[PDB]
Symmetry: D2
Subunit: 498 residues, 4 copies
Amino acid sequence: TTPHATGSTRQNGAPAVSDRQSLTVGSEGPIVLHDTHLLETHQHFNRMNIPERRPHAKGSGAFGEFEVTEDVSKYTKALVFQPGTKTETLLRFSTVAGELGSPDTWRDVRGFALRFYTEEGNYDLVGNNTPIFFLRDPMKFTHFIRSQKRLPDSGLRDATMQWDFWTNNPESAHQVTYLMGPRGLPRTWREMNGYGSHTYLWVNAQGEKHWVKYHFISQQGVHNLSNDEATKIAGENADFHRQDLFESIAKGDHPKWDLYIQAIPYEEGKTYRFNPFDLTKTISQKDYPRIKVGTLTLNRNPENHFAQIESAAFSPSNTVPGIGLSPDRMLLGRAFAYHDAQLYRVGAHVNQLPVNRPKNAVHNYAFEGQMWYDHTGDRSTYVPNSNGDSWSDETGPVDDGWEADGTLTREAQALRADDDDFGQAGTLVREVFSDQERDDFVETVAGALKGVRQDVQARAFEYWKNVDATIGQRIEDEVKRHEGDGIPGVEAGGEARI
Amino acid sequence: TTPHATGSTRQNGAPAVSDRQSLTVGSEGPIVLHDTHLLETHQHFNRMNIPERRPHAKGSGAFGEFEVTEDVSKYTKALVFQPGTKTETLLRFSTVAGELGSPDTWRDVRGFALRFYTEEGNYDLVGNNTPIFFLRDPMKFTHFIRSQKRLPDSGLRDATMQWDFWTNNPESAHQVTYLMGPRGLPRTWREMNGYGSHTYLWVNAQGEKHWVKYHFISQQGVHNLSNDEATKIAGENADFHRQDLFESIAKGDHPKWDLYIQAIPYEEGKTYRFNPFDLTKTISQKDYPRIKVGTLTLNRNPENHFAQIESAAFSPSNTVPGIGLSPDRMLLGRAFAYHDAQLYRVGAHVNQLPVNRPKNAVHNYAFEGQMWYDHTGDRSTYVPNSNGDSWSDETGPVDDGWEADGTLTREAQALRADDDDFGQAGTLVREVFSDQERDDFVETVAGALKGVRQDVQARAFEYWKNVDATIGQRIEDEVKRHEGDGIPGVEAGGEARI
Amino acid sequence: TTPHATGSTRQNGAPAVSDRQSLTVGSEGPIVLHDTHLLETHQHFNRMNIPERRPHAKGSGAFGEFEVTEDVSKYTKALVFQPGTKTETLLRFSTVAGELGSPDTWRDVRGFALRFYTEEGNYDLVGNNTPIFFLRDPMKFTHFIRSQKRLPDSGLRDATMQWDFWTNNPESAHQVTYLMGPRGLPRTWREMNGYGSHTYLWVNAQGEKHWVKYHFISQQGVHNLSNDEATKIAGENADFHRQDLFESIAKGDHPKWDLYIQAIPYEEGKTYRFNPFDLTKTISQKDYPRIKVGTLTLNRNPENHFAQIESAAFSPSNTVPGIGLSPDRMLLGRAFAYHDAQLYRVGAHVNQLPVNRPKNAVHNYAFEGQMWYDHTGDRSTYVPNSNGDSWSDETGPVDDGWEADGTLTREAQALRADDDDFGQAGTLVREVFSDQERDDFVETVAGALKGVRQDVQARAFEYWKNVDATIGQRIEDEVKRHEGDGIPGVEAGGEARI
Amino acid sequence: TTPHATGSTRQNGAPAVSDRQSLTVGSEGPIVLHDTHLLETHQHFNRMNIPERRPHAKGSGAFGEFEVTEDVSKYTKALVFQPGTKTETLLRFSTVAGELGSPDTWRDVRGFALRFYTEEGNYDLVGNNTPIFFLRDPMKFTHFIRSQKRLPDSGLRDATMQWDFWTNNPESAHQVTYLMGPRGLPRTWREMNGYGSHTYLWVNAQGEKHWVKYHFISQQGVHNLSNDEATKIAGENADFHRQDLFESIAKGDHPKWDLYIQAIPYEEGKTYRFNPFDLTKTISQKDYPRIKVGTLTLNRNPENHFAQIESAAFSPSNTVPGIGLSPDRMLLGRAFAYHDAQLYRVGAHVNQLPVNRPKNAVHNYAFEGQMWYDHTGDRSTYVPNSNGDSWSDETGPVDDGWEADGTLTREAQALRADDDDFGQAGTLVREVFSDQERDDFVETVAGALKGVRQDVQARAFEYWKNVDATIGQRIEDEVKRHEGDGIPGVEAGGEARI
Ligand code: HEM
């Protein structure tokens, strides 16, 4: 306490005098321009909001730990996955389409964004609750997300727009099937699996390469809500998932996931009968079984949601030695996009905020800019230099690379032996779902098509029949009778929609 | 169509070639850095979101017309209110606390933001659906809004925080009573009244001054939802109000409001038994009756929600000759705050966007800055100048002013004869509400207090007993039995809250 | 060093691999999109620049110490000025009109911006190298600065614009005389005086008030350059002053200034024969003599110019207990303007950057926003609260206030007995300047008028004759003969100017 | 004029009342918070400055016209270069290293940024006044520019840093030779040549490809200043080039350049004895002669420098059909970097500002964002769509592409038969320069090395001897005697430098 303290300060540390009354000319007079405490507090209030994420605006998370319990050193040299290693983590969960204040229990994909604070940098595995996605080229991603959001005139979400996009981009079928099935509505984030989705590259100490898939299997099981239940919860508690996570950890109920990988030898990646670089494809566990790595535990709530969760900036570009990207076009687009969005959303120095700083020493050739908190003193700004300030200069083929040859083109990826748009979705509907799940699926899909413009409905019937003739007929019959579930978060029809 | 057209362009107008596939080295190869269409489209996608309004993030609106049907020329010289004048309008409706994607049917205040595109500038009457507010000094406003939003650790709304603030700021009682009563949940925006809330100054052609209140009385009546109904709708259709407005106008059902004023002679403003400059007070219609002015009709939907509604920037500083502010401290704070927030939210040149431009010629001493669309050529940048570029230089007392005298102070406004924190709220509960409304009010308030930390509940009981001894006891009895309604948008208790 | 280190890292702390070659498909192939090190480094490079200050863009500074050597406790309770106190300082010097890369030796005002890192907050005394300024109302300031900068079409500085403004605002005469005299061209920043210019309020422990002027008298003396010398230096070394300061401190030659105040009793401020609240007036040292306080020494160079000097954010609003503002309209405008500019220039959290943080604990009701480095955990966001998080709530007249009474008006300040626009300037020319200084002054002013549009020249002759009939005739005679010095930084005439 | 007009307005179009006095409580009282005209004007003034370009901050330009006078339709299908076509242009000239207010006559590269407003989009040819550059990989560019700017502690330019960079990157020799020769100091922008520097791709109507170099040969000749003359001018008139251009056009003296290309058949690009994709190499005019295209005339000054020149945003990504990029790594980096910098410098909608809009219709899949002036109404936001809103979907090899094959690598480009770092520079010194130019060159280079740290000087002597043994010895001898010219804009040595 200072001699003239009053209970709080202005931004310069001087006593604020009052947090409750403005500076006026007498009790009845106007406010004066030089009420600097009023000005500082209001000008800051007016700049509290930052642009929400696009997509995945609505979310929350927690800190935890990852422990390696198996030996996978033969597949990677990454320090984080070496035998016995324990690493601090941060995980943010999210929906995709909805904005900052939208209900948690809308039918949607969920994000599973995981950071490992490793000894050789921050390693971000930015996943979802599905092993696949709707698209295989990033040029389509902007269109997709806009189709999932709002009409330009009325500002409403619209199933007609969603189905127009999906039916005109049949590569979407595998993921749309997954979304419309039971897993479109997780009961809690604790009761859903996480996946890397993409094929990544692992490189071992000898330079040998494997293509890898990541699977985070919940120790709490996979539990889902019905459309009706999720709708009810959306009204009663729009932050049901956020609350559940925080309360579970606060009570000492720490959720866990076991990490497994699939590991494909380098050369087999080029010849496998499904394209591992096609994000719409899963890789059969019969061909490439899951191999255990270790266990993820979440055990610590944030102390400040905005500083630690909202301001967190995850990026697939945040690889570490031993782990690389792959020829998956969607992943390569992501390598650019996140960092770019974060410069706008948070700032040029987003990676100097405590939650985004690595544990190891950063020695990076970047200087100046707004809000530069940790400056580099008189370090040289150029390389090579004669001043003893180090730089990197490895030449030749990179350890996390691969080969390419061809002419510059814009075209679809070449099909492997068993690649198509509909086969894997079919397999899901026919072989994986139970009878009860198929019944629910029909009611969901028919519901999602209710009120959809007729020409778009007609294309949807052909789309679903391509997935499976029987399910597609069942959906068609129900839509023609105007039956089906209400879908939390979206509807179609009426004068304010297409 | 150009000779080499492909169906769409890049930002420079050159053909885009593809909106569907990225530029790769062969079909199987990586994406190249020089896919400039991928880069432009993604970099723009990443900068689509802007900071949401704080407060009043969730909203929508429509264009319309205001017609003057009475003669109020004796009270004001403002062109917009002269006999027979018809003026184009824009109205945005909103909630207060919730973010961009939050349900429309939460219990809350609603915004009623009205712009008139007058011949002498844009006149903004930025109102609410209540004639009063919770506070009488703008220093408290930042605290209030933060109390209505989320806890810093868990990110949840919390009734304990809301009641802690309200019970420690008893000036809030009049508005908290209004909010907890029937009008806290409008059925539609068409079925709610709008109010200026503040006293404004009107000045006539001779310089005579009146203090005025604005009242917009819905021709559709005032209709409200129950807590249970609003909760159900929040789940089923989070954009119920936005949809209702758009569909009603699209069908030709144009909602109307009649404008009335109360007009207090200048000197009587200083002596009236309730303080007209205290935003927590209504002015009795027995003392100062409502006088009709004209009728507001909404008749045209936006063609682009984001450009015309989200990017609209309303401000109480946007007065026109004949209409001024008043010694209401809250209004004086608002004169600064909106324009300031909009510089951050939209940009320095927010008032050059079409929706925010006036109809008349702007000749303003402001130049340069980012995104300066309409430049001033070689116009002089300073005054006086010898180049024939005009400026303003009226000296002496302004026509929309008043007197003040005193020492610089931070203290509460002096009480008029009948000013207090609780009397008007009481009158509402005892005399205005029906028996059924009182019964509902008890269930609402008791519900809002369920799970609230006990020390804060105890202060709430004293607060409600100060409003009315009988209602306060009824609330206390119900809270002690753990009864009451669920309140859409908020709750208390549990490990993630206070 | 990590096991896989390469000499530098990316922003996530992972090895960068190369700071010298991009990632390509073979040696001859294109750059791939996923060269994330290329992207991070370029995207940061592209965001290194921040808006330059307006005005005072060109500058540099150093750290030092202020030691109180006299007892002025009877005039102020401010901790920084209590007997024997030593306080760390930061001082930035600057010109006014020129941009970031403009020569240091243009004829101009110099800034003298001094921060004291006190035990009760950062106290900023943001002065100039003159005791007066050109204007007495902040509405004119924007116009003035724009007149000192560039024409809207050609982008050139123009003496015609400068004189058009000055001659149409005769309040400018006192400062224009000072600027055109010897002190318009300091040889070094070490060899110029600094001044607070404005009257400030000092309040002692008993609540007694004095109006104060600050004077920083250089121990190195006041030494100036001729127009010809300054022009030569502008070509040979555009950073002459910046270099001089850095080299002098590096060699151990620490420049010093002694601080003196003038102290006017509170009531005498209202009756003195020159208006102490008029920034165009000096206060006679015969009436109110200088009183010594202590000594300022600069002794430490920055380690990083951009982080410590460019990103420094000084503000007259940064008062501390014992020191307040005054009824000087220009000072009251400054209380708002600096903080506002800094939110745009640097960011919302400009006062969390190390150079701008106070030494004492900040407990301020501001939360969230972009680049929030030092978060407040779970501290309450509202007041009063029941959670033990303190706030301020002092009521009544503030200790650094004063009285006012009147109607809202826009008009000139009332004249004291001896106030006018020209008298003090005259006194300077007639009584203070030597014969040689008068001769130089004539050559400077005539030079500054060379090529000026004839109608503006004619008004300038009347202006100078009002200052002093003899000097004004001498200037007129020289201008009519087209004689006079070239003025570093500006000229008039020709097809690209007025 | 409106009935209540006062000579100017606020931003909402209402009369401003005064541009000269603030709103106070009586003449002697404080300024009130609700002086909204003071607030608007100051808040805008505070946001007038935008980040300067990095690099090429200091510049100016003019509009003009390009006329095709020859038939080059066999080489390109680009509309802009078809027989007889006349196209409106905008050209911005600039230096590179210096900031916004830095003198025009520093020794430096000059920018030559040319936009053609074509019928098929804006085509930007963003050149320099040299056919080569210092570097051949964009990873080095950030380092280079930072080396040309200021030391991190003192904020001074430093020749030691410049030479440390250049001598450690010997690829720089060709361009450093050009810069240190006569053409480092153009007398005017009218008296310098412009060059595209890079190889670009031209594609004709049949799909046949040629690699092209652009050369803009001044009809005013090439005229240069001495170091001493340029230094003198830097002091006397820091805006000498800006003024010269504006005055010449104003007087009707319209500067012209003739455009010539070199055209290399596609296959010969891969085998030519100098690498056409190496920006440090010129292509011999004996092997590939210059072919005339047409003439560029500048004939119209800007009406607003800031809106039309400062806010102009040029980009090499702004190609048009018939013109593509090439495998030059530096060009490929530029395709990303400009647009990125402009999003920060100006805004997301930089290409909606009038100067940056194309003449033809833009139909681009980008929506929303700050300051969106020209919205897209209810146009579909996704593709394909069933709503009649067109998109692009060309599949297969692009017309402006080429082939690549290899593994992902970071390494130097493979050498052609006659590629090295020093040979072309030599040829310049030995064969192109006259005796007098060689004498001047020695004095320039020796001057540039004066005061440079001895170890860096020693490396510079080896560097210059590699260019030419005789010139290198002459430079060494002069440096060891401490002789040489002063170089405008830079020096070395002393306590504030390396
Ligand atoms: C990889 C190498 C280069 C990179 C990354 C690069 C980057 C940039 C950037 C970011 C700007 C500022 C753009 C803006 O803010 O509007 C710029 C300006 C400029 N650059 Fe480049 N540059 C490179 C090489 C070159 C070369 C080789 C040339 C000439 C052939 C050139 C000519 C120019 C010109 C003339 C400007 C100023 C344009 C104007 O007047 O607005 N640059 N450069």
